[PDB]
Amino acid sequence: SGFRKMAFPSGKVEGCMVQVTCGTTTLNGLWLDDVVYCPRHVICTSEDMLNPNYEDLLIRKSNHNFLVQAGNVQLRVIGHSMQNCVLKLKVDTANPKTPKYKFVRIQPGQTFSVLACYNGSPSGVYQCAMRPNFTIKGSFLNGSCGSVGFNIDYDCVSFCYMHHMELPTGVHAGTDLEGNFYGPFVDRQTAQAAGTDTTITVNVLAWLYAAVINGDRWFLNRFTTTLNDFNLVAMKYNYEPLTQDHVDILGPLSAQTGIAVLDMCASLKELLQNGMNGRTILGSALLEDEFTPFDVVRQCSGVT
Amino acid sequence: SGFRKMAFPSGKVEGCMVQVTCGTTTLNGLWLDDVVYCPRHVICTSEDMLNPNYEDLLIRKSNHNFLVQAGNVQLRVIGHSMQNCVLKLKVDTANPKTPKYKFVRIQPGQTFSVLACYNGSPSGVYQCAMRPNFTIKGSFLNGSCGSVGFNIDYDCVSFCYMHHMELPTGVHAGTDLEGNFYGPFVDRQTAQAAGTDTTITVNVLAWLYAAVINGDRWFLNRFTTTLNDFNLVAMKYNYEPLTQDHVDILGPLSAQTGIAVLDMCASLKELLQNGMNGRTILGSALLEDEFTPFDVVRQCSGVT
Ligand SMILES: O=C(Cc1cccc(Cl)c1)Nn1cnc2ccccc21
Ligand SMILES: O=C(Cc1cccc(Cl)c1)Nn1cnc2ccccc21
């Protein structure tokens, strides 16, 4: 028993982290096979970030201008190309530590592990959720650009995120591994705001199931509700509308606990309307939305 | 900016995880050099755990009874010995993936990363604190025994914890890497209770400094206090007494923010007496005590 914000073991990703330098800018790159992926803003200076013309900026750059360092050895760059907001540097050596990998674009509300890096070196790993407004509430500093987000399925690493920027609000924005930003963000030092962020309802429900599984049952009540009545309350509290697909995905947790999804919705409804009354659930005084139903099942069943 | 419960990158520890089987029991082992460390309760059956005589039980065991598997290859056991509550299995092959390592006994209130494992395979990594009552509030299931806790200093892994058992209260107990339990716990299926757990005051203060550093300043007030007045409040709220050493250790954070330690204590005093009034700090509705002043400095400075 016990329930933690658990990240995937990061070893397979650490073996791919490299340092990429261009001019005076240093950030992190992801070395998979003979290709190094990093944010294209590596070619900019502090002046260029105001309104960069990346095609024009990249044109003033040659393979020899990009310095890729893996640990303490230099990689030879034989090709360079821009794909959306990422630079793909072709190196003459394939990464001997390349794990089985896929590039995937996650959906808002899905979770992933982040290996925060500085100078191609990993410093920490944490679990994140892609917010409905496509931002991530991560922990990043200057130099963290190129740090990646991922999921692991037995031996396969699914890369889903590359860190690019911190918005003035403190939240983080980035791209998938093809360089397409999650959300409306652009890689430019201009004031950009994320939309209204909502709470991932299906994830809060999954976490309420984890709480029941772990002995915390105080919030369970003698009431029930309908999808329509529940969603009226969800809209008032800026919670994502619950669909029948969300109910379907909660099926394994509903079967494990013997608590119907709509009965759990009625508990959530009363938690929303009445608050926690100074009590906690799984050690938290607020409703946690950063565990998907898959994460709860995985953590509570022991999927290695 | 941003602040997360960040764990160390776990790669160096994954390369040491092995499966150890004895009779019908399977748990995790830690393979460093030519030695495999695992809980000694691997030699017990469900009947033996009631009141085991480990010396007598180990006597009925030979090197060939302990099956050590690293990935998919079998390790040859040439020696076996019990050191307190751990078995040390001497294998004929030194782990090629052995990182630079130390065995350390952490102090209550200190933090560490846990790589939860099942069948010698890692499934997740999370950050924990050794509670003042020597328990850890981890996330463990049956099969997790032998999972280790550690800290990393550049290239050196300091192993501090090995998981042994879950108490009936749901909290977790284990040993250092010499087999000495943290706390009064014994490796026996008998009702054992942990002491009263207090809040790690110095860690809550360090987290209040992280909150100031990250823009969350609502809780800062026009008041101050003394060590004596503050500790009167700390005792009423089951908070560890704050000593001048704790104030000294908070020095870097005090210097970074320009907020004197006793001024931060006065903010904590009012948070304790008045609650959060429905507000949050760093995304939490309660006072977080699982970040030491070192963790806050590391996370907020980017130590890789
Ligand atoms: O935000 C940037 C630089 C940048 C400016 C404008 C656009 C772009 Cl794409 C990049 N880097 N960055 C990422 N996370 C950080 C956290 C703290 C400070 C800087 C951090
Ligand atoms: O508690 C035990 C078995 C055991 C019984 C008595 C004493 C000893 Cl040393 C070990 N294993 N264990 C550890 N974490 C767990 C979590 C959920 C279930 C079982 C888990």
Side-chain angles (χ1 to χ4, degrees):
Chain A
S1 87
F3 210 70
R4 282 283 179 173
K5 197 75 72 75
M6 198 176 286
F8 285 97
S10 62
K12 287 164 181 317
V13 179
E14 299 167 48
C16 308
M17 300 317 301
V18 301
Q19 183 192 83
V20 175
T21 305
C22 188
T24 67
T25 309
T26 290
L27 44 68
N28 306 282
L30 186 67
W31 184 22
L32 295 170
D33 308 314
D34 57 346
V35 179
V36 169
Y37 305 85
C38 74
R40 67 176 180 169
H41 72 247
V42 72
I43 73 179
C44 307
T45 67
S46 54
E47 304 99 293
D48 292 315
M49 292 309 303
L50 305 181
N51 180 60
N53 191 311
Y54 290 96
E55 261 288 301
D56 292 3
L57 293 176
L58 190 61
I59 280 170
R60 303 296 139 181
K61 302 299 183 196
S62 288
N63 293 332
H64 73 254
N65 290 128
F66 296 101
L67 302 169
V68 185
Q69 202 175 322
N72 254 61
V73 303
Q74 210 69 22
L75 295 185
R76 187 173 302 277
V77 180
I78 65 181
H80 74 273
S81 70
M82 187 159 63
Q83 178 179 10
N84 304 310
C85 306
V86 298
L87 293 190
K88 292 191 298 186
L89 302 174
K90 194 187 166 190
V91 287
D92 73 352
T93 301
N95 187 354
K97 306 212 198 83
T98 301
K100 293 174 203 205
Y101 77 91
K102 276 188 177 166
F103 284 170
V104 301
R105 187 161 173 97
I106 52 136
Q107 289 286 291
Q110 292 312 109
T111 60
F112 60 93
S113 291
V114 171
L115 179 70
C117 300
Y118 301 89
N119 302 95
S121 296
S123 47
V125 62
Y126 55 92
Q127 191 72 1
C128 277
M130 174 63 62
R131 303 302 319 162
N133 68 359
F134 291 104
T135 62
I136 83 163
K137 297 192 163 175
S139 175
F140 292 116
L141 302 175
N142 217 103
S144 66
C145 305
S147 294
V148 304
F150 61 98
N151 285 275
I152 305 173
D153 196 12
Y154 172 41
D155 57 355
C156 187
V157 179
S158 288
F159 291 97
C160 62
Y161 178 79
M162 177 164 271
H163 185 55
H164 286 240
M165 57 173 199
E166 180 174 277
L167 298 172
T169 66
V171 299
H172 303 104
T175 74
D176 58 27
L177 271 291
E178 298 187 329
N180 299 109
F181 265 94
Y182 283 101
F185 313 109
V186 290
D187 49 355
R188 179 196 177 182
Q189 181 98 89
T190 197
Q192 302 171 55
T196 306
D197 194 42
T198 61
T199 299
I200 311 138
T201 311
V202 67
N203 293 6
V204 170
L205 286 167
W207 170 88
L208 292 182
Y209 277 112
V212 165
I213 288 170
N214 285 284
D216 240 349
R217 334 166 49 102
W218 69 266
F219 59 85
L220 289 176
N221 61 30
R222 311 177 161 272
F223 323 132
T224 204
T225 184
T226 66
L227 258 190
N228 273 189
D229 175 60
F230 176 79
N231 289 335
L232 274 183
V233 185
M235 193 169 59
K236 175 169 139 79
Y237 288 94
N238 299 89
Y239 262 63
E240 271 270 349
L242 201 72
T243 66
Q244 184 56 50
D245 283 16
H246 293 141
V247 177
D248 284 358
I249 282 162
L250 293 160
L253 290 173
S254 178
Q256 206 190 313
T257 61
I259 299 168
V261 176
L262 301 171
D263 289 1
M264 192 62 90
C265 287
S267 298
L268 177 54
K269 172 171 166 211
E270 292 313 306
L271 283 169
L272 284 180
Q273 296 169 348
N274 306 351
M276 318 254 299
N277 278 119
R279 289 184 292 273
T280 78
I281 296 172
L282 283 174
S284 173
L286 35 75
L287 300 160
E288 299 285 329
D289 76 345
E290 295 209 344
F291 296 101
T292 66
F294 302 89
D295 297 340
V296 175
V297 166
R298 198 177 308 113
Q299 193 173 157
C300 301
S301 81
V303 176
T304 70
Chain B
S1 87
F3 210 70
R4 282 283 179 173
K5 197 75 72 75
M6 198 176 286
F8 285 97
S10 62
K12 287 164 181 317
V13 179
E14 299 167 48
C16 308
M17 300 317 301
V18 301
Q19 183 192 83
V20 175
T21 305
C22 188
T24 67
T25 309
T26 290
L27 44 68
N28 306 282
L30 186 67
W31 184 22
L32 295 170
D33 308 314
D34 57 346
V35 179
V36 169
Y37 305 85
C38 74
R40 67 176 180 169
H41 72 247
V42 72
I43 73 179
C44 307
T45 67
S46 54
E47 304 99 293
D48 292 315
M49 292 309 303
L50 305 181
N51 180 60
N53 191 311
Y54 290 96
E55 261 288 301
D56 292 3
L57 293 176
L58 190 61
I59 280 170
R60 303 296 139 181
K61 302 299 183 196
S62 288
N63 293 332
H64 73 254
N65 290 128
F66 296 101
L67 302 169
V68 185
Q69 202 175 322
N72 254 61
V73 303
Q74 210 69 22
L75 295 185
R76 187 173 302 277
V77 180
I78 65 181
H80 74 273
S81 70
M82 187 159 63
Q83 178 179 10
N84 304 310
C85 306
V86 298
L87 293 190
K88 292 191 298 186
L89 302 174
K90 194 187 166 190
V91 287
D92 73 352
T93 301
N95 187 354
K97 306 212 198 83
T98 301
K100 293 174 203 205
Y101 77 91
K102 276 188 177 166
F103 284 170
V104 301
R105 187 161 173 97
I106 52 136
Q107 289 286 291
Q110 292 312 109
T111 60
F112 60 93
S113 291
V114 171
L115 179 70
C117 300
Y118 301 89
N119 302 95
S121 296
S123 47
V125 62
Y126 55 92
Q127 191 72 1
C128 277
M130 174 63 62
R131 303 302 319 162
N133 68 359
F134 291 104
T135 62
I136 83 163
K137 297 192 163 175
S139 175
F140 292 116
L141 302 175
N142 217 103
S144 66
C145 305
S147 294
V148 304
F150 61 98
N151 285 275
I152 305 173
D153 196 12
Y154 172 41
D155 57 355
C156 187
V157 179
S158 288
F159 291 97
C160 62
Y161 178 79
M162 177 164 271
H163 185 55
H164 286 240
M165 57 173 199
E166 180 174 277
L167 298 172
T169 66
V171 299
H172 303 104
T175 74
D176 58 27
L177 271 291
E178 298 187 329
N180 299 109
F181 265 94
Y182 283 101
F185 313 109
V186 290
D187 49 355
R188 179 196 177 182
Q189 181 98 89
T190 197
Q192 302 171 55
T196 306
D197 194 42
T198 61
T199 299
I200 311 138
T201 311
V202 67
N203 293 6
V204 170
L205 286 167
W207 170 88
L208 292 182
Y209 277 112
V212 165
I213 288 170
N214 285 284
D216 240 349
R217 334 166 49 102
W218 69 266
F219 59 85
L220 289 176
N221 61 30
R222 311 177 161 272
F223 323 132
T224 204
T225 184
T226 66
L227 258 190
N228 273 189
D229 175 60
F230 176 79
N231 289 335
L232 274 183
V233 185
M235 193 169 59
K236 175 169 139 79
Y237 288 94
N238 299 89
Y239 262 63
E240 271 270 349
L242 201 72
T243 66
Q244 184 56 50
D245 283 16
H246 293 141
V247 177
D248 284 358
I249 282 162
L250 293 160
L253 290 173
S254 178
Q256 206 190 313
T257 61
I259 299 168
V261 176
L262 301 171
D263 289 1
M264 192 62 90
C265 287
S267 298
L268 177 54
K269 172 171 166 211
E270 292 313 306
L271 283 169
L272 284 180
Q273 296 169 348
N274 306 351
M276 318 254 299
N277 278 119
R279 289 184 292 273
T280 78
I281 296 172
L282 283 174
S284 173
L286 35 75
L287 300 160
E288 299 285 329
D289 76 345
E290 295 209 344
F291 296 101
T292 66
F294 302 89
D295 297 340
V296 175
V297 166
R298 198 177 308 113
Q299 193 173 157
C300 301
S301 81
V303 176
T304 70

